[PDB]
Amino acid sequence: PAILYALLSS
Amino acid sequence: SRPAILYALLSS
Amino acid sequence: SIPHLILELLKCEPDEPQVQAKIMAYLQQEQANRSKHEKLSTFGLMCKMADQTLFSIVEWARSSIFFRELKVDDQMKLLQNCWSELLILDHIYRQVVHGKEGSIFLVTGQQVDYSIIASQAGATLNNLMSHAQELVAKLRSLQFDQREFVCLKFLVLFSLDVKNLENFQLVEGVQEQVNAALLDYTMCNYPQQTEKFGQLLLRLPEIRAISMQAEEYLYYKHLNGDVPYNNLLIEMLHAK
Amino acid sequence: SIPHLILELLKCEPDEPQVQAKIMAYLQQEQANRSKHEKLSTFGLMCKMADQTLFSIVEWARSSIFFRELKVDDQMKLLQNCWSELLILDHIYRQVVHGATLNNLMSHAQELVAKLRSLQFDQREFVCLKFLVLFSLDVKNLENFQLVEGVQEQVNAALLDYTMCNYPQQTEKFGQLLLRLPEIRAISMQAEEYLYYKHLNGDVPYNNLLIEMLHA
C-alpha cells in the first residue's frame, strides 16, 4: 500500500 | 499487470 | 481526577476546529476546480470526506509514542485491521457530542436530515444509519465523554486480533495500561453509573459489526466504479 | 466495384447505430437506477460510453477474419497497442457520417473529420483503415508477425484498388487516407494522456475495460 507506506515513512 | 477483463473476453 | 496516561493520550488529539476547516476547504476546492460537466456527486463528496478523515486518523496514530514503537510493517497491519472501526467510532462520537436528533453531523460541520436518508437511500445504508443511531443513543445514555473516547480509540487501534505482529508485546502492554486507566477514570468520574466501564466496552463488538457492514457497502460501491480512487480510502479497501 | 477482400471485411462489421442505441439504452437505465445523490456526471457518462464501445470493438476483433486465427496472447498484444486509435477512428467516422487540453484534443479531432468529409470517406475505406490500425507493424513480440505483414500488404492493395476504381477523379485518395493514420495515432496518444490525468485525480469511472487499457 503506497499511500499509507509514504505517510508512515515520512 | 495483464488486463484481466480483456484477457477474459479473448479467452472465452 | 484523570489518570496520567489519559492526559498523555489526550495530547494526541487533533484540534477539532482546524480539522473541520481543513476538510471543509478541501471538499469546497475539489468541487470548485471541476467544470460543470465533471462535478462530484454527493456520494463522491462523502467518499472524499471519509478519505480526508482517514488521513487525519493516520496523523493521530503517528503522534502516539506507543504506535512509534512499532516497525512500519506492524503499524500498517494495525491500521489495516481497524481503519473502518476508527471511522465509525469517530462518526458515532461526533453524533454523541454535536448531533441533533433528526439529523447527522458531519466532520465538515454540515448537518444532514435523517429523513433525506430515509427517502433517498437504499436499504443497506438505511440499516447502517439506524444501527449507528442506536449506538449513539446508548453511548449518550452512558455519558460517554472525550477521555473515554480517546481510550476506546487506543483499544481499537492496538488490537489483539491482529496476527503476525513482530511486536505483539507492545500491543498487549497498551491493552493492559489503557484498560486499567479507563477503569480508574470511569469509577472516579461517574460513581453513580456503577457498571459504566463494562457497558462502554460492550459497544466495541457493536462497532466492529457496523464497521464490517460499512466495508461491505463501500466495497460494493467500489465494484460499481463509484468510489473516487487513487486515495487512502481505496487503499484500505484493498488491504490484506 | 469492390475487391472481394473488402466485402469480407464488411461482413465482419457490426451495425454501429444499433450498437450505439443499445449503449444509450443501457446508460439511460443505469442513470435512472441511480439516486439524485449518485447521478453520473456528463464526463462519467462519456467514459462509460467509451468503455462500452470498447467491448463492441473487442467483440468485433475477436470475431473477425484473420484476427480470429491468432493465439490469445497475440490478440492481446494487438488490442493493447491500438485500442485508443480504434476508439478515435470510431468517433471520427461517426462525425463524418452524422477545458483546455480537451479543447486542443477536440480541435485536432475536428480537423481530421473535416478532411475526411472533403474526401468523401466511405464505409469501405473505413473498414480497411480499421484493419490497418488493428494489424499494426508497431507491435513487438508477436508469435505470428507474418500475418500482420500479409494483412498490411493485402489491405493496402485492396484499398488502393477500391479508391482508384471508385474515386478515379481523386488521383491521390489512397495516399491522402493513409496520411491520416499517424494523425489518429497522435490524437489517440493525446486522448490517453488526458484520460490518464483524470484517472490520477480519481474522476474516471473504473473497474472496467477502459481503465485496464489505460494502465496496460
Curated annotation (Swiss-Prot), chain B:
Liver. Low levels of expression were detected in heart and pancreas. The chain holds residues 16 to 27 of 257 of the full protein. Arginine methylation by PRMT5 enhances repression activity of metabolic genes in liver in response to bile acid signaling, by increasing interaction with cofactors. Belongs to the nuclear hormone receptor family. NR0 subfamily. Interacts (via N-terminus) with NEUROD1 (via N-terminus and C-terminus). Interacts with ID2. Interacts with RORG, NFIL3, NR1D1 and BHLHE41. Heterodimer; efficient DNA binding requires dimerization with another bHLH protein. Interacts with RARA, RXRA, THRB, NR5A1, NR5A2, NR1I3, PPARA, PPARG and EID1. Interacts with HNF4A; the resulting heterodimer is transcriptionally inactive. Interacts with DDX3X; this interaction disrupts the interaction between HNF4 and NR0B2/SHP that forms inactive heterodimers and enhances the formation of active HNF4 homodimers. It is found in: Nucleus; Cytoplasm. It is linked to Obesity: A condition characterized by an increase of body weight beyond the limitation of skeletal and physical requirements, as the result of excessive accumulation of body fat. The gene is NR0B2. This is Nuclear receptor subfamily 0 group B member 2. Transcriptional regulator that acts as a negative regulator of receptor-dependent signaling pathways. Specifically inhibits transactivation of the nuclear receptor with which it interacts. Inhibits transcriptional activity of NEUROD1 on E-box-containing promoter by interfering with the coactivation function of the p300/CBP-mediated transcription complex for NEUROD1. Essential component of the liver circadian clock which via its interaction with NR1D1 and RORG regulates NPAS2-mediated hepatic lipid metabolism. Regulates the circadian expression of cytochrome P450 (CYP) enzymes. The lineage of its organism: Eukaryota, Metazoa, Chordata, Craniata, Vertebrata.
Swiss-Prot record, chain C:
It is found in: Nucleus; Chromosome. Residues 229-240 are annotated as: AF-2. It comes from the Eukaryota. Changing I117W: Reduced phospholipid binding. Strongly reduced transactivation. Residues 1-240 form the NR LBD domain. The C-terminal extension (CTE) loop competes with a DNA minor groove anchor of the nucleosome and releases entry-exit site DNA, thereby promoting opening of closed chromatin. Orphan nuclear receptor that binds DNA as a monomer to the 5'-TCAAGGCCA-3' sequence and controls expression of target genes: regulates key biological processes, such as early embryonic development, cholesterol and bile acid synthesis pathways, as well as liver and pancreas morphogenesis. Ligand-binding causes conformational change which causes recruitment of coactivators, promoting target gene activation. (Microbial infection) Plays a crucial role for hepatitis B virus gene transcription and DNA replication. Mechanistically, synergistically cooperates with HNF1A to up-regulate the activity of one of the critical cis-elements in the hepatitis B virus genome enhancer II (ENII). Belongs to the nuclear hormone receptor family. NR5 subfamily. This is Nuclear receptor subfamily 5 group A member 2. It comes from Homo sapiens. The chain holds residues 300 to 539 of 541 of the full protein.
